[PDB]
Design a protein around this nucleic acid. Structure first.
Ligand SMILES: [Mg+2]
Ligand SMILES: [Mg+2]
Ligand SMILES: [Mg+2]
Ligand SMILES: [Mg+2]
Ligand SMILES: [Mg+2]
Ligand SMILES: [Mg+2]
Ligand SMILES: [Mg+2]
Ligand SMILES: [Mg+2]
Ligand SMILES: [Mg+2]
Ligand SMILES: [Mg+2]
Ligand SMILES: [Mg+2]
Ligand SMILES: [Mg+2]
Ligand SMILES: [Mg+2]
Ligand SMILES: [Mg+2]
Ligand SMILES: [Mg+2]
Ligand SMILES: [Mg+2]
Ligand SMILES: [Mg+2]
Ligand SMILES: [Mg+2]
Ligand SMILES: [Mg+2]
Ligand SMILES: [Mg+2]
Ligand SMILES: [Mg+2]
Ligand SMILES: [Mg+2]
Ligand SMILES: [Mg+2]
Ligand SMILES: [Mg+2]
Ligand SMILES: [Mg+2]
Ligand SMILES: [Mg+2]
Ligand SMILES: [Mg+2]
Ligand SMILES: [Mg+2]
Ligand SMILES: [Mg+2]
Ligand SMILES: [Mg+2]
Ligand SMILES: [Mg+2]
Ligand SMILES: [Mg+2]
Ligand SMILES: [Mg+2]
Lengths: 183, 109, 579, 62, 51
RNA sequence: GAAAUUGUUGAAAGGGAAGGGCAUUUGAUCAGAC
RNA sequence: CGUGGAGGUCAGUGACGAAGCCUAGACCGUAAGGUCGGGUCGAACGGCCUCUAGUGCAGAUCUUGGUGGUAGUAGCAAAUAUUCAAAUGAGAACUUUGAAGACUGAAGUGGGGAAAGGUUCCACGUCAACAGCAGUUGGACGUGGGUUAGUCGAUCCUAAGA
């Protein structure tokens, strides 16, 4: 374990990590951030929809040159896709997450995904063939993923107001006059 | 809910295949039939009786007929739950001319 | 139907296992036919050895054929038209001192056995030879089925020198070894359980310091006793013994490998020898692997020996092998060792290199055979029932009405052709061989120093369901048969033991089944001719003052009376000589 | 099941082209167990396998 | 007959033959990246358009 | 187990580059004090 | 000012954390640099006095190694062509079978060899990597089987030559 840093309370969260998977790193990172912060029941149905092309994954960083679609309007962006393979693995990490959660005794409708991250696996290397008898690297950008689901706690409202008040000698006598005037 | 039907439709293939690539022409008809039957009885799960296949290909890739008389049956799906409880099945009806025939409910018995 | 259903699972298992008259007469023909067998072997045995020289000493390979072909003689004459399946349940197996069982040589091999052991010898000089020397403990195991119902004979005959000083042919002297202490321990225990299975018909005349009326017979009762008789005589109860419930085409030994739902019986393994040594510290911790093997109906087939409680209308087998102890200072575990065909394994002068003479067909395993000789064996082996055989039984000439040298040659030329169809079946595992094993004592102090990297629990053994997987149990954790051979193969501490094997079949009948009697005990393979002890003197026997011992003497002479509510019949043999 | 081999041996035993070999689609479990010529022999005479009729080139027009 | 046999599996085999394919792949990619530079070394090349 | 390079969270900023210099505003953050 | 090693000295520092590495935390020095706190780490190291050198990097179309932007873009388009069901299967555009449609069209996409290949043939297992999509298939991977000569070749003879 030792995931990317978490602001979560560990007791109430579940975690799932695949690694060295075969997927577009640039595509899977996108599909991640589409679902980040969501409630789980939600996102699950969502990815399903995408798999049928009812919704899409807005491409917010590695977007360059893609075709623009209608379904982007939803998230207010013109560039979006349906990365079918990238999803299979996320559902996978989502399917599992739901499960590791239920063995810890955490409520399934109180679940949501707080923390989702994808960084780069070691690239893997093939050969490829070009004109004039030259050779170029032919590679994949395999992808690490980790997914930390949280049990929703809205129960936090804490009273913090810390006043150590330094008031001058003038400042004191001038409050004493407002309260002498029968404020 | 939806209930378990059968009907007989004439399809105009002539219009749906209009201006297709001669080499890909027939294969469209296969898709244009599955699409057509997800229209009526929007079952979305459509299967093709291989006789119908021999009907669509009987004339070769470029020679698909102008009109088919198609017996379509809505039926229930089994075990192994698919997204649908419901089925679609298209198979041929042997008939002189596809001309001037009206859609008809064949009463199942 | 092709599908084996719940309708027929009921029609096959509980129905044909109903005790009815049509059924009993099949068993009764088997009780005598089998005892008519032992009486024949017994005859031939002494004719050669004890008395005057008849111009050849028969050999063990010799007596096997004559024995078997005689037991074919008697199945020719009974239910000939009436019944489809009639045959030999277990083939004649003649065994010697250290041998547990499984020894059934074909004629071909006396030059093979001789050859292989040419170098390493002098312990086993009786087995390799086939000639039997004096002072030997010799089992003879026979069984027969009629319509798939099994009656089994087992007895331990001691052979003696010959004293002609008395014109009366007296076997001079008694048997003065701890050897004889074994056979009289089993002979005692045989009568012991004989009288116990009478009390489960009715809790009548049941020993009071033992059972009461709460239990006619219990899982714990029978087991507590036999180990008492053992510890009495200091004879180690062999790991191979059992007390079994039997059915049509289902018997204990037929397939030790193939599983049985709804299992009934008392089982004895090495997993039980630790429990007796480990009854000192009562620690209940069982270190268990969660494996789902032999999982289906584990409840019934796990072989619980406590949950067995005797019923009436059941057919039981008593199987007892009791290994004697030459004095062994440090306490140890009694185990079985297996005998191979390959010389190279060992430089030990004391090893036996031999061949398995018994086989079995597993209808589970299906493999297409390319060879045309191993095919003719396959469809032939399937022309026989579910019981163990040797390659001789399969043939045209095997019963051989008139026995000539011309016929001895007819079978030998065939054996070789069947040897070659045997290779292709035995490697593809379409058939399993019978293990030929030795009696092996081990010091406890080898196994408690045991250092192992862990490893294969894989299923290679004929052993039954639960016990086998780890063999030596969980409280010994880390030990499987493999690391056991390794331990058993540090040999300064190794030693081997004589054995007395005893098989009785007992059929429990009520007054609906037995009319003239009132509730009775039918002893098949119990005949007065077959159960004869041999001259024996041992200073161990008969420990008084144990409530279980005093209850056996009470019950020993209790079955000794006709005021006893359960009258014990002994099936008498048949008439042998006809010419 | 993978029936390539069974179709190959069929052409060789029957002694005709792989074109002309019929394997009963309903027999696909049984044909699986063939795996040798003499077995295919049995299957060939049995009728689970059959050598298909030659397509026609008619000279009547010429 | 209650004996139910699907199972045959050995982790020792799969796991330890797993590393194997995983080590050598590491070495094949490493023979690639050593030679990647001058793989395109082409002495006695003829430019088509250059003078 | 560094750098380049990369993901996530935090903060901050952005009308055709960014970055630095002098100076103070606002935000954070730390020493000296006895 | 700093660096790798030597002689000397602080009866120097150290498993109660040595060196290293991270640090919009502090401190001295004009500067080269030194010094402390935190984190990380697990076995050796530093100050002064002297000796020595393979002693300090932004460059050299510098040397090897490692990584981006470019960019999920260029592209994956010659050889007329595929389609329906069933089977198998965690999974089928691509495997197996049936069905239908087509191509090579005897100077063939057919059946045999030489040169060269060396096990690629065949079978049972199998899908991490390879087959620039896939993969339940394979010229891949793992375990094995497979080549039988008095008459076919080599062998013998001589050619240009050696
Ligand atoms: Mg652009
Ligand atoms: Mg473009
Ligand atoms: Mg290229
Ligand atoms: Mg080239
Ligand atoms: Mg057009
Ligand atoms: Mg470079
Ligand atoms: Mg490390
Ligand atoms: Mg960095
Ligand atoms: Mg310094
Ligand atoms: Mg140096
Ligand atoms: Mg440190
Ligand atoms: Mg920094
Ligand atoms: Mg230099
Ligand atoms: Mg440098
Ligand atoms: Mg540099
Ligand atoms: Mg450069
Ligand atoms: Mg690049
Ligand atoms: Mg493109
Ligand atoms: Mg390409
Ligand atoms: Mg192109
Ligand atoms: Mg093309
Ligand atoms: Mg394709
Ligand atoms: Mg043509
Ligand atoms: Mg052409
Ligand atoms: Mg070819
Ligand atoms: Mg060839
Ligand atoms: Mg091949
Ligand atoms: Mg294969
Ligand atoms: Mg590929
Ligand atoms: Mg793949
Ligand atoms: Mg290979
Ligand atoms: Mg000759
Ligand atoms: Mg010649």
């Amino acid at each position: 374990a030792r995931y990317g840093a978490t602001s979560t309370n560990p007791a109430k969260s579940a975690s799932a990590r695949g690694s060295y998977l075969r997927v577009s790193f640039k595509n899977t990172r996108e599909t991640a951030q589409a679902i980040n912060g969501w409630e789980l029941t939600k996102a699950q149905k969502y990815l399903e929809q995408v798999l049928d092309h009812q919704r899409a994954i807005p491409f917010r960083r590695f977007n360059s040159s893609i075709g623009r679609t209608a379904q982007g309007k939803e998230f207010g962006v013109t560039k979006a896709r349906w990365p079918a393979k990238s999803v299979k693995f996320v559902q996978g990490l989502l399917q599992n997450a739901a499960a590791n959660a239920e063995a810890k005794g955490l409520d399934a409708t109180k679940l949501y995904v707080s923390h989702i991250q994808v960084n780069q696996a070691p690239k893997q290397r093939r050969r490829t063939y070009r004109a004039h008898g030259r050779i170029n690297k032919y590679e994949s950008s395999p992808s690490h993923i980790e997914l930390v689901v949280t049990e929703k706690e809205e129960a936090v409202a804490k009273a913090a107001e810390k006043k150590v008040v330094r008031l001058t000698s003038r400042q004191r006598g001038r409050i004493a006059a407002q309260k002498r005037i029968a404020a | 809910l939806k209930d378990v039907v059968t009907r007989e439709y004439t399809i105009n293939l002539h219009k749906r295949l209009h201006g297709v690539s001669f080499k890909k022409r027939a294969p469209r008809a296969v898709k244009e039939i599955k699409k057509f039957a997800k229209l009526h009885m929007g079952t979305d799960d459509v299967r093709l009786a291989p006789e119908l296949n021999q009907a669509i290909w009987k004339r070769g890739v470029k020679g698909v007929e102008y009109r088919l008389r198609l017996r379509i049956s809505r039926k229930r799906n089994e075990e192994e739950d698919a997204k649908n409880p419901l089925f679609s099945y298209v198979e041929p009806v042997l008939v002189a001319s596809a001309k001037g025939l009206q859609t008809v409910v064949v009463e199942e018995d | 139907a092709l599908a084996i259903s719940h309708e027929d699972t009921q029609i096959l298992l509980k129905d044909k296992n109903i005790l009815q008259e049509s059924v009993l007469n099949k068993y009764r023909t088997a009780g005598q036919i089998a005892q008519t067998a032992l009486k024949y072997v017994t005859s031939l045995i002494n004719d050669s050895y004890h008395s005057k020289t008849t111009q050849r000493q028969l050999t063990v390979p010799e007596l096997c054929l004559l024995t078997d072909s005689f037991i074919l003689t008697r199945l020719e004459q009974y239910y000939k038209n009436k019944v489809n399946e009639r045959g030999i349940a277990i083939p004649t197996t003649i065994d010697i001192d250290q041998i547990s069982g499984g020894w059934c040589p074909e004629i071909d091999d006396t030059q093979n056995l001789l050859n292989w052991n040419k170098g390493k010898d002098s312990t086993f000089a009786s087995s390799v030879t086939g000639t039997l020397r004096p002072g030997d403990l010799v089992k003879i195991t026979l069984g027969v089925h009629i319509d798939g119902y099994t009656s089994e004979v087992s007895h331990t005959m001691v052979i003696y020198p010959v004293d002609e000083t008395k014109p009366i042919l007296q076997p001079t002297g008694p048997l003065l070894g701890g050897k004889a202490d074994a056979v009289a321990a089993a002979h005692i225990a045989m009568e012991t359980v004989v009288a116990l299975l009478a009390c489960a018909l009715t809790p009548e005349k049941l020993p009071a310091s033992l059972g009461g009326t709460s239990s006619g017979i219990t899982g714990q009762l029978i087991r507590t006793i036999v180990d008492t008789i053992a510890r009495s005589y200091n004879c180690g109860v062999v790991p191979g013994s059992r007390v079994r419930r039997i059915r049509r085409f289902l018997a204990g030994q037929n397939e030790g490998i193939v599983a049985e739902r709804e299992y009934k019986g008392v089982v004895w393994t090495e997993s039980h020898q630790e429990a007796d040594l480990l009854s000192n510290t009562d620690a209940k911790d069982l270190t268990v692997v969660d494996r789902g093997q032999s999982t289906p109906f584990t409840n019934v087939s796990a072989i619980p020996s406590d949950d067995f409680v005797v019923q009436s209308g059941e057919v039981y087998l008593i199987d007892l092998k009791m290994a004697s102890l030459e004095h062994c200072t440090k306490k140890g575990l009694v185990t079985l060792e297996t005998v191979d065909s390959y010389t190279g394994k060992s430089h030990k002068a004391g090893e036996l290199i031999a061949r398995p003479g018994a086989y079995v067909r597993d209808f589970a395993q299906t493999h297409i055979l390319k060879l045309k000789t191993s095919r003719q064996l396959l469809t032939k082996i399937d022309k026989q029932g579910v019981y163990p055989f040797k390659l001789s039984h399969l043939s045209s000439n095997f019963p051989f009405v008139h026995e000539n040298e011309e016929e001895l040659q007819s079978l030998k030329k065939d054996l070789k052709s069947f040897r070659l169809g045997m290779s292709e079946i035995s490697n593809n595992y379409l058939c399993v061989e019978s293990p030929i094993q030795i009696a092996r004592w081990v010091p406890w102090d080898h196994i408690l120093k045991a250092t192992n990297p862990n490893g294969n629990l894989s299923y290679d053994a004929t052993s039954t369901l639960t016990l086998p997987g780890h063999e030596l149990p969980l409280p010994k954790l880390g030990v499987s048969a493999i690391k056991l051979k390794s331990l058993m193969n540090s040999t300064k501490e190794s030693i081997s033991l004589p054995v007395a094997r005893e098989c009785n079949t007992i059929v429990l009948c009520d007054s609906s089944v037995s009319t003239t009697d009132r509730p009775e005990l039918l002893r098949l393979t119990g005949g007065s001719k077959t159960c004869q002890p041999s001259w024996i003197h041992s200073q161990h026997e008969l420990n008084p003052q144990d409530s279980i011992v005093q209850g056996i003497f009470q019950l020993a002479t209790l079955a000794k009376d006709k005021r006893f509510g359960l009258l014990l019949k002994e099936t008498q043999p048949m008439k042998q000589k006809s010419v | 099941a993978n029936l390539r081999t069974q179709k190959r041996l069929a052409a060789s035993v029957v002694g005709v082209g792989k074109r002309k070999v019929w394997l009963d689609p309903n027999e696909t479990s049984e044909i699986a167990q063939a795996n040798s010529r003499n077995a295919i022999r049995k299957l060939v005479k049995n009728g689970t396998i059959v050598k298909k009729a030659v397509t026609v080139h008619s000279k009547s027009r010429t | 007959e209650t004996r139910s046999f699907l199972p045959a599996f050995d982790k020792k085999g799969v796991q330890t033959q797993q590393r194997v394919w995983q080590t050598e792949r590491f070495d094949k990619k490493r023979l690639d990246k050593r030679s990647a530079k001058f793989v395109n070394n082409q002495p006695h090349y003829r430019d088509q358009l250059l003078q």
